[PDB]
Amino acid sequence: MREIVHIQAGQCGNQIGAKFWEVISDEHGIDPTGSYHGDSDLQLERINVYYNEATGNKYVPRAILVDLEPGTMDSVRSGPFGQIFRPDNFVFGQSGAGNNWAKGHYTEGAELVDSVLDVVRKESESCDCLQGFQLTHSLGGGTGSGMGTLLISKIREEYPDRIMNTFSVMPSPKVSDTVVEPYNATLSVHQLVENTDETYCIDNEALYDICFRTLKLTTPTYGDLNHLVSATMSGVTTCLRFPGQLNADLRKLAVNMVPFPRLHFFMPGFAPLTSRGSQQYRALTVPELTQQMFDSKNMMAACDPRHGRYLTVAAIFRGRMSMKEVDEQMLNVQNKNSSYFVEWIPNNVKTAVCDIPPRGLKMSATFIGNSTAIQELFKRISEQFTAMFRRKAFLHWYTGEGMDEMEFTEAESNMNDLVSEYQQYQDATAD
């Protein structure tokens, strides 16, 4: 379990995907050219997890950029770390997907998926011990959702023994009022429920609410939202990229976090919540970090954990802090809120510490929860999907690409069963 192969598809997938590399690279001393320029020796121990070391002492990200629209690849290279990627790892088509899941999954995406698999095959053959695959995309678009789930399915067959990890951005009317996005999301969820081991649900609804109400940003921009995404992705991957006491991998995380195969959608949380050019006040204490990361306002999925029950939880504390102070504060939040943790899963809260803090913060806490309250995210998508599907609005866009209306019903039926499963274990008792 060493190498992780990163994949980013579509406009959203490549945007937050680029931000991810700009962040962890800054945290590992890698510059826009790939040369190590850090002052710590602990930032190269697990460096091979995400970077291929070139012979010239260079470090290149093990990432693959995909998109049916060439306009997104150009903007990536202009970005700071645009040249660090392998130019061969750019697989961009001509005609976009038009926000159509069917276009990305069955027609235009199908013509390009084979070319992307060849690049994925290359990256996997030159691996010492392939840990798994990591995908960043959005579920409301055409390329990331349509062609993204297609790649997931194809990679699941060719690499069935590896882990499938996704950073799926959920649509929301607060960011883009495109009534077809509930279609694309419900069809993608049906795929993610069957072909992935772990999915971090990054909800644009929660990202907007954080900036609008908490960060007091009246007109939130994609950069303001992705500022939260890059911080969440960095935290949830800190234990994969740094030594620490854990030496964690994608499989050990999945084994201890996913009690049931289909219930593998994680609710990420971060603290402190900041804005671009903010970092206000004087950090925060461990007790402040604990209460914030369990607060619904610090959640990246628009869900209230107090309306459900945690099945499993993983908290990472990054910074110089008393490991004893963390153990008690974590212990207090569990005995205090003992009702919000299932009794039939003993010791369902794991805590880790990494002295390397995130770059403009000294104390930080990232949270990963498998709570039954995530059903509210799927219910919101299901309500919007049903409202559009009942009126059969825009269905000719999908049927015209070969899709059948029975695939919509099968998609909605599957997502409703997922909500039912969460309610099962939210009201179950040891008895």
Binding site: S172, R380, E383, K392
Partner: protein
């Protein structure tokens, strides 16, 4: 039979074709299999020019299909504010109920069309209207945790 050609023209947004078809006696109130009229299709796909033309030549603004959907229903669902303005100006039933018990306010709130929610409210949208499941527009906002919508429904 210019009926099916007018329905297809309104759906595609071909204004010129709509003007010619109506000039050859095309039934402005034509309906397809499900009962949709040219005004239903023009409002569903945001063709403001075709919506007005139809409403100026005897289109039934409150026509319903087999499912009970009115033009304002579909416009409030897709989020076409301007078309919602015109429909209401020509006497659209702001509290029309379809086969699912949904009103235009239900659909606009479910799809997060906050501005359209305000327009429907200022035009007498029934906030106590329940659907087949007994949920009002406010119930939906409370169930989905949409604070912005909740604040609006409390005018």
């Amino acid at each position: 039979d210019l009926g099916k050609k007018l329905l297809e023209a309104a759906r595609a947004g071909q204004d010129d074709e709509v003007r010619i078809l109506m000039a050859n006696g095309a039934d402005v109130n034509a309906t397809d299999a499900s009962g949709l009229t040219p005004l239903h299709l023009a409002a569903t796909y945001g063709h403001l020019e075709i919506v007005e033309v139809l409403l100026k030549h005897g289109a039934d603004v409150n026509a319903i299909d087999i499912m009970g959907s009115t033009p304002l229903h579909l416009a409030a669902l897709i989020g076409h504010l301007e078309i919602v303005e015109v429909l209401l100006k020509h006497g659209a039933d702001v509290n029309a109920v379809d086969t699912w018990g949904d009103t235009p306010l239900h659909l606009a709130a479910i799809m997060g069309h906050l501005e359209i929610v305000e327009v429907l409210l200022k035009h007498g949208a029934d906030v106590n209207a329940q659907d087949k499941f007994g949920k009002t527009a406010f119930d939906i906002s409370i169930d989905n945790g949409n604070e912005d919508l909740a604040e609006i429904l409390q005018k």
